[PDB]
């Protein structure tokens, strides 16, 4: 499984923006879970699985999340 | 915190559409977790902050009758 972790600044629609970006890149989730960040009081972390057909978008959505959104992101 | 548990039909952008509804109603999540369900669906466990309460009747309307999700639980 493709595993991706990212951290977002807390606000309404924070996750929705990420998922819109995923959808627009034909990325499809098989798992999501959140937890409050232990590092920053104003951040939430998200652990996701993506299906294998999402692989061609993977390098690129990582860069977009970091660049367009300012998320901290890591492929696991 | 408001507990809301619902299923969606599996498709690219399934969750994005729901989170757009939430966002447009000023609903803020504090937790999300998915699980595969019904073979072609996913179940979502969410918590909404108390400030989301004025939105509940509208998001339930749209979730049930527009998006066509099944709501398994709503509790506060
Ligand atoms: N595969 C769907 C539903 C889904 C979302 C998140 C986790 C698991 C399933 C999507 O990407 O929107
Ligand atoms: N509160 C933010 C981030 C978040 C999403 C989902 C779960 C937890 C936190 C939002 O509603 O988008």
Residue numbers in the entry:
A (entry chain A): 34 to 109
B (entry chain C): 34 to 70, 73 to 111
Mind quoting what the paper says about this structure?
Phenylalanine hydroxylase (PAH; EC 1.14.16.1) catalyzes the first step of l-phenylalanine (Phe) degradation via its hydroxylation to l-tyrosine, and serves to metabolize excess Phe in the diet. Some, if not all, of these regulatory properties are likely mediated by the N-terminal RD, as deletion of the domain liberates the enzyme from activation and renders it constitutively active.
Trypsin-treated hPAH-RD19–118 yielded diffraction-quality crystals in the presence of Phe, allowing its structure determination at 1.8 Å resolution. The key finding of our study is that the binding of Phe to PAH-RD restructures the ACT fold, forming the necessary inter-subunit dimer interface and the resultant Phe allosteric site. To reconcile the difference with the recently reported rat PAH full-length structure, which did not reveal ACT:ACT interactions in the unliganded form12, we propose that the rat full-length PAH structure in the absence of Phe and our human PAH-RD structure in the presence of Phe could represent the unliganded ‘active-site blocking mode’ and the Phe-bound ‘multimerization mode’ of the domain, respectively.
